[model samples]
Target: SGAIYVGNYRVVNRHLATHNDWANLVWEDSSRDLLVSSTTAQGCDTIARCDCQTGVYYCSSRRKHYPVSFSKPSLIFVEASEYYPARYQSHLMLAVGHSEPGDCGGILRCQHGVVGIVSTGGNGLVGFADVRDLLWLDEE
Candidate 1:
């Protein structure tokens, strides 16, 4: 089966100093997996997929291959108990890209930290005013 649909580019709110580029995000429920795809200003597209259930991760970039290794599982998912029949059952949302990364010989490694909304292309500096997720309900 195809991966379960989750979040998207609309979830990101780029600061005034940052570009409007967005990453399309998704998740798989049974496996509890996640993926991210983003295109840089120079049209360098990169796709990252993580199998939280199996510890297998790899990214294909327009310029190079990125070997991914997620140190931990996601903790951003909302349980049905919070908003069940009233909300979309089986629906999940992952708020990613909060921590910073370090590198040695151009190889990057990042440790899990606080999970929150973040703008791309910043040096751990805060220029954010406000970021939020507001879901609009529509009868389907």
Candidate 2:
């Protein structure tokens, strides 16, 4: 009998979405807002809000910076909880992760993840942000 095997790989990232404990980054804010972590020094102390409809990242409030660091590369994640200021529409954002130039400490694209890629590999579908666990409102 043969056993199923799963392999781990690192595609040699230039600026991978690496993160660690106390440091987090996520996207899909409200099934819309794209999110980045408050991990890196530049991105720390704030939750960057990117709008899906309008395509805008709003840093409305600057929360106190959290002191945390990562020794190696990792995947970033974000979680957003919103309250409706307009109506009783339960607005919930998805917490996705993305990486920019010199943003994260490392660069490696993993399956079921998000990476700001320049091009795709075999499929050639522009290996951009690797999206996973993103259950859209395309509720079936």
Candidate 3:
């Protein structure tokens, strides 16, 4: 008889409707009242491997740079959390990892776990800052 396989996944920030998942959970000062592009209002930081036919990639907030291999895959929808502000009324900024094709940082699309910085404007979209921790969840 063959055994059934059960896979394991960490729903850390699963489907929280964020701009940058796998990065640190960053939020702007509620009293700052500035665009999501302001550095004055910023806060902290993973890597998971979806590449290589081996191990899962888990990048923690302990570092800044990481090497990329095999690009990002399509997004899967998960329920949003109520603890934080909303970037959009009904849309989920599904960003598992990786910057858009060409745009610079600031303005991400996420799907789980809060590990990036967000602002008042930009629809609560997680913006990027220098040394801001980034998350990359890729596992094999």
- Off by more than 4 A, model 1: 1-9, 13-62, 73-140
Global lDDT of each candidate: 0.21, 0.22, 0.23
TM-score of predicted model 3? Answer: 0.17
Tens digits of per-residue lDDT for model 2, 1-140: 00001121122122232453214433323222123333232211111122222111211122111112111212323221121122211122212233222222221122222222121111211112222232321121
lDDT of 2: 0.22
Better of 2 and 3 by lDDT: 3
Clashes of each: 0, 24, 33
* The 10-residue segment with the lowest total lDDT in model 2: 1-10
Q: Compute each candidate's TM-score over C-alphas.
A: 0.19, 0.19, 0.17
**Residue-wise C-alpha lDDT for candidate 3, range 24-108, written one tens digit per residue:** 3333222221112212222322322122211112222212333222222222222233433433322112222333212222222
> Which RMSD does model 3 reach against the true structure?
16.7
